[PDB]
Design a protein around this ligand. Structure first.
Ligand SMILES: Nc1ncnc2c1ncn2[C@@H]1O[C@H](COP(=O)(O)OP(=O)(O)OP(=O)(O)O)[C@@H](O)[C@H]1O
Ligand SMILES: Nc1ncnc2c1ncn2[C@@H]1O[C@H](COP(=O)(O)OP(=O)(O)O)[C@@H](O)[C@H]1O
Ligand SMILES: [Mg+2]
Ligand SMILES: [Zn+2]
Ligand SMILES: [Zn+2]
Lengths: 309, 163, 609
DNA sequence: AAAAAAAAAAAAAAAAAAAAAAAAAA
DNA sequence: TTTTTTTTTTTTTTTTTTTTTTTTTT
């Protein structure tokens, strides 16, 4: 199978950064991993300024430009570091880990969002105006063949319900008709929040621009409506899954209650040709995926005496 | 032949009367019912500075008594209220609109209000003045809202977008 | 020799004609072309207009051109391109960019300097032609000029967010994990058949990676036909505009713009599922140039200083703000002091202390207060002029409203929030409703507005200044009755205003004749800076912060005590603000006796009325 | 080459009834 | 002062029909 060479260099560089930084010699990141081991946490925090001094930014800029393609190698290196220094954090009561970046040099507004930063690591600021429920998202799927009863596991899903194609045994011939084992599958927390532009960035006469920010994992409910929050994460693009052939008849080929814009009828450039689409046209829109959130806008004596210095 | 017809015209249009296919949705319920249309081929509408109009004004000047006659000929059915007819003439013409420097502006338009008891020919006088000037609108009470309808939303059925 | 298929355009002659045009053209040929008499040839004939712009662009590094059509027609040999561009814009523009590619090299190596030219090689250039032809409205567009450059005019209604457009697809193999990029042409993606790797070579093993592709930016604009050109009994028409690359996010909503672009028509599908199309195309335009309808230089600083060195700066800008208004110099003094405002401070322990001046004008009904308010509206940088007669009870603050275009929620600020850091003018103060009045009460007391609706709880910032104008009950303000009965305003609301002025109109022969005289002189057809005030105001408001010295202490304490020989403590904090605002004028960095004397004189002349 | 099955195609909206507020007066 | 008066504010879509035209599937 074809492998990458730059990804390997980023993976070893991240391991060296985690093992060697130690600048306060305190082993600050090893201190954090020990704190996670004792407190049973599932997320790590990496500062950009700390990384901004090793390799003269060669690693930092490489991570920033292509965060989307380098995240799998960063997690792979983190797994090896955890195994080497704290095996207890390798299994649960495996913990799906998360990496949280913060303290980026420059901040962006919502009106600086262009398609040429898709996949890059950014930080944005805005006022929250709507939050949704904490729904469970399917992370690692598990199925059973209807006839063989063979078990498949760890079937990655990107944006739609994806079942496996080839049975584990080549003796079996089966293209479909699987049964999700909802008990064995891994799930994660999911939340969608709507944000708009700040009162100062809004021009004299303007209808405010909006965006969809996705919070996942331990970052749920940390943004409340009406507050002013600074998000940081990766800028992604989300397709329309309805015309990507969803299994159920419930989608019913884009059932609608309101009338779409006639102005952008045929003006929105949709790509065709793919076999999954058929003769349909796939469309895209820009959303944000956030990994770290910050905000920028007990009468018991015994417990009280504990907190104070 | 395109652009020969405009809204508000009484015309006599000739053409071929043809059946529309009515296909697509809601065709099944009709079955054998069809739409129709007329392919147009001819138009007959029922109804400037030149020496002619240069001489018309001179003729009217030589006629004399321009003020009184102009006021009087306005709505000859109604007898009396001659001063009102003088004032409606001044309203028909417009005063000077001078744009003073540094942002100051002065209006030349006329604001005439006519009060009085009911049944004095209140509402023929007005309608009649609307005939004289092409640029004029007769707006009435709360039956329709047109005086302040400077709305920015228009749910036009053709496209369902705001105008 | 060879010609691009379909058209008659050939690159060979076009490139040579364009280089001859650029190195040859001057204002000499331009003024020979137009030759409208009274045409200046004072050294302009040899200025080499194109080469100087080319060099200044090279040294700046920006890629923006403003090639005109009349200037392109000026040269005799390149006259062919004038009629060769109107009919084939795309290919001619492609030649345009290709020639500009080496227009850089033609000038960088004339003296053989050490410019890298590598960043020039990487970057690309384009052109923005304008004034292509006679401007025609959207109401006259036939199918006879599809794919031809036109110039349109219209009102901007709305804009859409940035739209991604795929350029380079990206396919990965689910077996051998091999990555290959496939370019797309006109939207259609040619699917890879089987993995290129001969060893892997498996049928139907392709997966699309959406977030590893390459995208470009699009924007769509909506225009409306201008009300002037529409005839009677008609409804305005609409046109959609396509904007790409650097021109995205240029046209604000509600503006009126004239654009240049290529007319185009595309088909739209009849049925969503089937391949079938219907025999009626949609028409739009792809735009290439758009036109509509801080950073002060050191010379500006010098002229500001020398003007500030004037003996009497107070009276000059007293008369400049309202040239039309005759007399009423005292209210203009107060407004001039208000437009600067005392210094603002927020220390940790005590908290924020206000630095805005509030002024209320009231009196007989046919004075000129509304014109005064509309005068101060323009001078101030950021402000809003809305009457208080009606509208929503929170119309000056945030109002959570349902979005019209989308069934979503939008938080829209009001007029007090939109006048943050400036002067907000309220007209018809007496008609403002009893329920909305309380809103202003929290604005003039804490300078913040809190909204708690639809699950949103938040606070905004007002920090503005209120200048208001009111009218009494009746045709006159009789002096015998006190202020309270006539103005119909709550005593606290009137009290919290920093300065209150009474405008009186008495039948005086001298005053009446003098007023009528200059009014008629203005109607008769036969020391006021234009924009110096705005820059001086910005300089004083954004850089200058005065302080207080004991010289102000000695006068202020004894002045307040002497006024207390029914002056509330509000009076002293009003004197301090006015004195510190006067100190910001006659540019200084500290207060002295003159400022406090002027402030007390103003606040006692206010008491006299 | 000839069968059995499965969706698209909706669109639309005024006109009336009931309940709670925020301005008017014997 | 406690009575009458007044604007006004969501209320709306869950359903349909047999052709006609597409994809799978012996
Ligand atoms: N001076 C007049 N000359 C001729 N007819 C008159 C005159 N004054 C009143 N009329 C009559 O009054 C009528 C026209 O006015 P009308 O009473 O219809 O409307 P109005 O004055 O607006 O009153 P209302 O309040 O009833 O609407 C006609 O019957 C007309 O004959
Ligand atoms: N002192 C004055 N100087 C110049 N014009 C005046 C003066 N006083 C009154 N006017 C005239 O009277 C009119 C005043 O109207 P305005 O003050 O805007 O109405 P309002 O009384 O509603 O504020 C203006 O058209 C103005 O020309
Ligand atoms: Mg009548
Ligand atoms: Zn199987
Ligand atoms: Zn392969």
């Amino acid at each position: 199978k074809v492998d990458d060479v730059t990804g390997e260099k980023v993976r070893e560089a991240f391991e060296q950064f985690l093992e060697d930084f130690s600048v306060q010699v305190e082993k600050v990141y090893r201190a954090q991993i020990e704190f996670m081991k004792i407190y049973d946490l599932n997320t790590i925090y990496i500062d950009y300024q700390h990384l901004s001094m090793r390799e003269n930014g060669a690693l930092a800029m490489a991570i920033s430009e292509q965060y989307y393609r380098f995240l799998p190698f960063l997690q792979k290196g983190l797994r090896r570091v955890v195994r080497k220094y704290a095996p207890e954090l390798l299994n649960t009561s495996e913990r799906v880990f998360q990496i949280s970046f913060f303290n980026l040099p420059t901040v962006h507004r919502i009106r600086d969002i262009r398609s040429e930063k898709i996949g890059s690591l950014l930080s944005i600021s805005g006022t929250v105006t709507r939050t949704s429920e904490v729904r469970p998202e399917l992370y690692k799927a598990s199925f059973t063949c209807d006839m063989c009863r063979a078990i498949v596991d760890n079937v990655e899903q990107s944006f739609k319900y994806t079942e496996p194609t080839f049975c584990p045994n080549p003796s079996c011939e089966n293209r479909a008709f699987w049964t999700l084992n909802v008990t064995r599958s891994r799930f994660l927390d999911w939340q969608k929040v709507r944000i708009q532009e700040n009162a100062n960035e809004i021009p004299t006469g303007s209808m405010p621009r909006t965006l969809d920010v996705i919070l996942r994992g331990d970052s749920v409910e940390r943004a409340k409506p009406g507050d002013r929050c600074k998000f940081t994460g990766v800028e992604i693009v989300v397709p329309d899954v309805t015309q990507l052939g969803l299994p159920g008849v419930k989608p019913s080929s884009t059932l609608d209650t309101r009338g779409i814009s006639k102005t952008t009828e045929g003006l929105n450039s949709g790509v065709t040709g793919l076999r999954s689409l058929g003769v349909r046209d796939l469309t895209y829109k820009i959303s944000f995926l956030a990994c770290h959130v910050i905000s920028i806008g007990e009468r018991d004596q015994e417990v009280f005496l504990n907190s104070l210095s | 032949l395109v652009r020969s017809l405009s809204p508000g015209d009484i015309v006599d249009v000739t053409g071929i009367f043809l059946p529309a296919p009515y296909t697509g949705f809601k065709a099944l319920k009709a079955g054998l019912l069809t739409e129709t249309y007329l392919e147009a081929q001819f138009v007959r509408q029922h109804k400037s500075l030149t020496s002619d109009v240069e001489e018309r004004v001179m003729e009217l000047i030589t006629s004399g008594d321009v003020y009184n006659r102009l006021a009087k000929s306005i709505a000859p059915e109604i007898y009396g209220n001659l001063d009102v007819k003088k004032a409606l003439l001044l309203l028909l013409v417009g005063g000077v609109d001078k744009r003073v420097g540094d942002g100051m502006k002065i209006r030349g338009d006329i604001n005439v209000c006519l009060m009085g008891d009911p049944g004095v020919a209140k509402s023929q006088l007005l309608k009649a003045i609307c005939k004289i000037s092409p640029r004029g609108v007769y707006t009435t009470g709360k039956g329709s809202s047109g005086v302040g309808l400077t709305a920015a939303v228009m749910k036009d059925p053709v496209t369902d977008e705001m105008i | 020799l060879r010609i691009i298929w379909g058209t008659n355009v050939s690159i060979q002659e076009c490139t040579t004609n364009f280089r001859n045009f650029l190195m040859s053209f001057k204002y000499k040929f331009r003024k020979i072309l137009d030759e409208r008499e009274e045409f200046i040839n004072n050294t302009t004939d040899e200025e080499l207009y194109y080469i100087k712009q080319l060099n200044e662009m090279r040294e700046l590094g920006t890629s923006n051109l403003n090639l005109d059509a009349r200037n392109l027609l000026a040269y005799k040999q390149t006259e062919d391109l004038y009629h060769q561009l109107l009919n084939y814009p795309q290919e001619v523009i492609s030649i345009m960019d290709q020639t500009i590619k080496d227009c850089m090299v033609s000038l960088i190596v004339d003296n053989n300097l050490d410019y890298d030219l590598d960043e020039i090689e990487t970057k690309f250039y384009k052109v923005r032609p304008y004034n292509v032809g006679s401007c025609k409205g959207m109401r006259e567009l036939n199918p006879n000029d599809i794919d031809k450059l036109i110039n349109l005019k219209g009102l901007v209604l709305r804009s859409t967010p940035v739209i991604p457009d795929m350029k380079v697809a990206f396919f990965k193999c689910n077996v051998c994990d091999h990555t290959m990029a496939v370019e797309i042409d006109r939207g259609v993606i040619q699917e890879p058949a089987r993995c290129e790797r001969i060893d892997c070579n498996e049928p139907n093993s392709m997966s699309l990676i959406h977030n590893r592709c390459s995208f470009a930016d699009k924007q769509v604009i909506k225009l409306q036909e201008t009300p002037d050109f529409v005839p009677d009994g008609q409804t305005p028409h609409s046109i959609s505009l396509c904007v790409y690359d650097e021109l995205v996010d240029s046209c604000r909503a509600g503006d009126r713009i004239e654009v240049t672009g290529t007319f185009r028509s595309i088909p739209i599908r009849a049925n969503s599922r089937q391949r079938v199309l219907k025999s009626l195309y949609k028409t739009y335009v792809d735009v290439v140039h758009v036109k509509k309808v801080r950073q002060i230089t050191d010379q500006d600083l010098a002229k500001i200083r020398e003007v500030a060195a004037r003996e009497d700066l107070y009276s000059l800008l007293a008369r400049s703000i309202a040239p039309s208004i005759y007399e009423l110099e005292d209210v203009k003094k107060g407004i001039l002091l208000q437009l600067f405002g005392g210094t603002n401070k927020t220390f940790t322990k005590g908290g924020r202390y206000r630095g805005d001046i509030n002024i209320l004008l009231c009196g007989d009904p046919s004075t000129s207060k509304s014109q005064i308010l509309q005068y101060v509206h323009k001078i101030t940088p950021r402000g809003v002029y809305t009457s208080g007669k009606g509208s929503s009870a929170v119309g000056l603050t945030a109002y959570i409203t349902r979005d019209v275009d989308t069934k979503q929620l939008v938080l829209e600020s009001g007029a007090l929030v939109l006048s943050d850091g400036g002067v907000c003018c309220i007209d018809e103060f007496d008609k403002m409703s009893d329920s909305t009045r309380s809103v202003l009460h929290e604005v003039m007391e804490q300078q913040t507005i809190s909204i708690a609706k639809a699950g949103i709880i938040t606070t905004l910032n007002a920090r503005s200044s209120i200048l208001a104008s009111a009218n009494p009950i009746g045709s006159r303000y009789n002096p015998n009755l006190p202020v309270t009965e006539n103005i119909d305003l709550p005593p606290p609301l009137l009290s919290r205003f920093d300065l209150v002025y009474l405008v009186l109109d008495k039948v005086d022969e001298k005053n009446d004749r003098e007023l009528a005289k200059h009014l008629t002189n203005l109607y008769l057809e036969d020391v006021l800076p234009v924009e110096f005030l705005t820059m001086y105001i910005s300089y004083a408001k954004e850089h200058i912060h005065p302080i207080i010295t004991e010289a102000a202490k000695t006068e202020l304490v004894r002045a307040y005590v002497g006024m207390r020989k029914t002056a509330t403590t509000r009076q002293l904090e009003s004197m301090i603000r006015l004195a510190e605002a006067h100190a910001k004028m006659k540019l200084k960095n500290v207060v002295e006796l003159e400022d406090v004397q002027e402030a007390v004189r103003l606040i006692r002349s206010a008491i006299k009325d």
